[PDB]
């Protein structure tokens, strides 16, 4: 039993390494100044944003700079572009979770929809400290303060993610822990519209056992870590709910915003 | 047409 659980943990960690280019290990190395690489460009204000701005990954008809006169909208679009690529990464990872691709294809789609926002905020915590967030594949750092200074509605956009990240990072998970945690989140059987719930629940049961074992071995002195982590899954759901509410506000007030069709598919009836 | 489905069916 336990041998298979360990094998499952290792399978998931290897797949995680293949799917996600910027890991927590790499991010923490950068954030702690423990890398040989040139340290990130810091965007803490409007002037540093000009310089740094061309560092944001955005690929479109015109450069990011020309998208809006409003800085908050350009940052918004940057987050959106990253989000699309993050969904692609999570999809590849999900395909590596044993049993997932054998589920009803429509159930695979449903799991990814509801799941991808929760996973994005989990991993986002890997890129954060209490003062800001790594951007552009770790080549940039945007301060929490600067993000908070954006005009409403956009000023409160990132703050709940930072709050979650502070608590979540206090758990000191590493990438092997996270690989299983994320797999657990994807395989939630209570997602709306799931056709076959039981097979999904079966896989999640197995993943949850693997996670429990992983946390006991990797964090022997952290008591009830498993319990604390499960409660975080529920927290993430609340984060997403509030994010969607803000997005609806933005949609009503600002027509200068445009959603990528992939994100539109994800947000529809969600 | 689902773009998620498109990504899932990618190689
Ligand atoms: O809420 C999110 N996605 C959901 C979403 C947002 C916008 C439009 C439609 C859907 C979200 C927010 C922040 C994110 C990510 C991934 C990384 N960061 C950090 C970050 C910070 C600053 C910049 Cl400029 C950047 F490019 C990236 C995802």
Residue numbers in the entry:
A (entry chain A): 207 to 476
B (entry chain B): 141 to 151
Text from the published report:
Upon binding of an activating full agonist, the AF-2 helix is locked in an active conformation, which allows the recruitment of co-activators required for transcriptional activation.
In this paper, we identified a novel synthetic compound, VSP-51, which acts as a selectively modulating ligand for PPARγ. The compound VSP-51-binding pocket of PPARγ is enclosed by residues from helices 3, 4, 5, 6, 7, and 10 and the AF-2 helix as well as residues from the β strand and a loop region between helices 6 and 7. The majority of the pocket residues are hydrophobic residues, similar to the pocket of PPARγ bound to Rosi and other agonists. Notably, the amide group of VSP-51 does not interact with those three key residues, His323 at helix 5, His449 at helix 10, and Tyr473 from the AF-2 helix whose interaction with the acidic head groups of TZDs may contribute to the conformation of the receptor related to adverse effects of the TZD drugs. As revealed in the complex structure reported here, VSP-51 does not form hydrogen bonding interactions with the AF-2 helix, which may partly explain why VSP-51 functions as PPARγ partial agonist instead of full agonist. The existence of this pocket indicates that introducing a proper side group into the indole nucleus of our compound at C2- or/and C3- positions may be a new direction to modify the compound to improve its therapeutic efficacy targeting PPARγ.
